[PDB]
Scaffold this active site. Structure first.
Site, PDB file in Angstrom:
ATOM      1  N   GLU A   1       1.264  -1.058   0.216  1.00 36.50           N
ATOM      2  CA  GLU A   1      -0.346   0.193   0.058  1.00 36.50           C
ATOM      3  C   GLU A   1       0.734   1.152  -0.053  1.00 36.50           C
ATOM      4  O   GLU A   1       1.964   1.533   0.374  1.00 36.50           O
ATOM      5  CB  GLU A   1      -1.115  -0.220   1.411  1.00 36.50           C
ATOM      6  CG  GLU A   1      -1.973   1.165   1.520  1.00 36.50           C
ATOM      7  CD  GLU A   1      -2.736   1.223  -0.063  1.00 36.50           C
ATOM      8  OE1 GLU A   1      -2.664   1.602  -1.031  1.00 36.50           O
ATOM      9  OE2 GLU A   1      -4.009   0.383   0.150  1.00 36.50           O
TER      10      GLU A   1
ATOM     11  N   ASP B   1      -2.069  -5.351   0.900  1.00 37.77           N
ATOM     12  CA  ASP B   1      -1.429  -4.316   1.732  1.00 37.77           C
ATOM     13  C   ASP B   1      -0.009  -4.713   1.520  1.00 37.77           C
ATOM     14  O   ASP B   1       0.341  -3.595   1.863  1.00 37.77           O
ATOM     15  CB  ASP B   1      -1.935  -3.759   2.864  1.00 37.77           C
ATOM     16  CG  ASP B   1      -3.506  -3.694   2.917  1.00 37.77           C
ATOM     17  OD1 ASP B   1      -3.661  -2.572   1.687  1.00 37.77           O
ATOM     18  OD2 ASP B   1      -4.562  -3.656   3.163  1.00 37.77           O
TER      19      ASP B   1
ATOM     20  N   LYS C   1     -14.881  -8.957   3.366  1.00 43.70           N
ATOM     21  CA  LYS C   1     -13.571  -8.985   2.375  1.00 43.70           C
ATOM     22  C   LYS C   1     -12.988 -10.548   2.286  1.00 43.70           C
ATOM     23  O   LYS C   1     -12.231 -10.814   1.424  1.00 43.70           O
ATOM     24  CB  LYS C   1     -12.967  -8.478   3.467  1.00 43.70           C
ATOM     25  CG  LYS C   1     -12.539  -6.732   3.186  1.00 43.70           C
ATOM     26  CD  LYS C   1     -11.823  -6.562   1.672  1.00 43.70           C
ATOM     27  CE  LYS C   1     -11.549  -4.429   2.015  1.00 43.70           C
ATOM     28  NZ  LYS C   1     -12.454  -3.570   1.365  1.00 43.70           N
TER      29      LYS C   1
END
Ligand SMILES: C[C@H](C[C@@H](C[C@H](C[C@@H](C[C@@H](CCN1CCCC1=O)N1CCCC1=O)N1CCCC1=O)N1CCCC1=O)N1CCCC1=O)N1CCCC1=O
Ligand SMILES: O=C(NCCc1ccncc1)c1[nH]c(Cc2ccccc2C(F)(F)F)nc(=O)c1O
Ligand SMILES: [Mn+2]
Ligand SMILES: [Mn+2]
Length: 180
Positions: free
Chosen positions: A65, A93, A119
């Protein structure tokens, strides 16, 4: 249209975190001028992933990220052809070198149950780890393996609740909560 949320996010977050958030939003065709709650959400998410990587040891985490789309992918491929881990369907991430697995950080405003359910259904690639934080204080991770120690995650929750308190004190929390 200059909003209060925008100025508060600029006063509340690190200038570099703000700039990276702006770059991400504009790269995905979104305007921080008007998409203010999303701007705040990506700022919190960025700071949370950065504090997460701050935990652990020195060479522990690789940060995905923050990098732009193409370069973040490039690093994902490098890590995959290095360690031999299944290439995730969507950009994660972080990557844990010690546990040898990708990490999808999550910051949610509502129940952590619903958010992780969503998710995890949207990931399906059960190889990568999932760690969800919340503004109200809860956290929850895959296999109850919270990766980091307790103190770093306590720091993350304290920061999230501080941001929530500031948003509430500026009469901005209710519009933020009903945004996700
Ligand atoms: C390395 C460089 C930028 C890093 C930025 C990232 C964020 C880090 C900032 C540091 C300073 N701290 C630590 C104390 C407070 C602070 O402010 N933290 C962590 C807490 C919040 C925050 O902000 N980190 C992590 C390693 C050191 C560093 O600086 N990033 C940006 C995304 C990818 C990355 O590695 N890179 C690398 C190449 C491109 C680039 O720009
Ligand atoms: O990685 C992420 N996005 C990557 C692509 C992207 C990054 C920045 N800006 C726009 C696009 C990511 N996004 C979110 C929140 C979210 C969830 C679903 C759709 C859109 C968003 C939002 F707000 F980001 F646009 N929560 C996470 O935990 C997380 O990892
Ligand atoms: Mn991400
Ligand atoms: Mn995430």
């Amino acid at each position: 249209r200059g909003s209060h949320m925008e100025d508060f996010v600029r006063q509340c977050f690190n200038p570099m975190i703000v700039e990276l958030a702006e770059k991400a939003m504009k790269e995905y065709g979104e305007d921080p001028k008007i998409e203010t709650n999303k701007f705040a959400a990506i700022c919190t998410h960025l700071e949370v992933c950065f504090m997460y990587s701050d935990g652990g040891s020195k060479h522990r985490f690789e940060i995905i990220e923050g990098r732009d789309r193409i370069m973040a992918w490039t690093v994902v491929n490098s890590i995959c052809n290095t360690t031999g881990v299944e290439k995730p369907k969507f950009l994660p991430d972080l990557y844990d070198y010690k546990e040898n697995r990708f990490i999808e950080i999550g910051v949610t405003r509502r129940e952590v149950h619903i958010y992780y359910l969503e998710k995890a259904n949207k990931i399906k690639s059960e190889k990568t780890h999932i760690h969800i934080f919340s503004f109200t204080g809860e956290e929850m991770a895959t296999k109850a393996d919270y990766t980091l120690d307790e103190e770093s995650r306590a720091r993350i929750k304290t920061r999230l609740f501080t941001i929530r308190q500031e948003m509430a004190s500026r009469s901005l929390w209710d519009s933020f909560r009903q945004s996700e």
